[PDB]
Amino acid sequence: VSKQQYADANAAYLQSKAAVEQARINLRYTKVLSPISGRIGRSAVTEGALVT
Amino acid sequence: CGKSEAPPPAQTPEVGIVTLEAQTVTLNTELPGRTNAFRIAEVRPQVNGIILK
Structure with missing residues (x-):
């Protein structure tokens, strides 16, 4: 196989590898993590509520 | 007739x-406040359209 075909095949592979990370960070947003350490107040919103 | x-x-x-006497007793305080539900969900539509049923 030519070097150009390996080049753009590797390019498309890295492109899909970036897209799956773009999906994985959105999965990481659905479990909201504490950005810092410390005390937390009471939850102003509760279960069953819609957030945007 | 007098002095009596x-x-x-x-x-x-x-x-x-x-x-x-000395006697031990516990102390209490009354504070004002409100009641709140354990979990309350106001339903909000996640799509667009008119209600049918």
Whole structure:
């Protein structure tokens, strides 16, 4: 196989590898993590509520 | 024909006396506030359109 075909095949592979990370960070947003350490107040919103 | 009615000195009675002693007791405070649900969900539509049923 030519070097150009390996080049753009590797390019498309890295492109899909970036897209799956773009999906994985959105999965990481659905479990909201504490950005810092410390005390937390009471939850102003509760279960069953819609957030945007 | 006079010089009588010698006033008797008072004995000063009827003092109901309670003695005091050390006694442990717990303390309490009343605070005002409101009641809140354990979980409340207001339903909000996640799509667009008119209600049918």
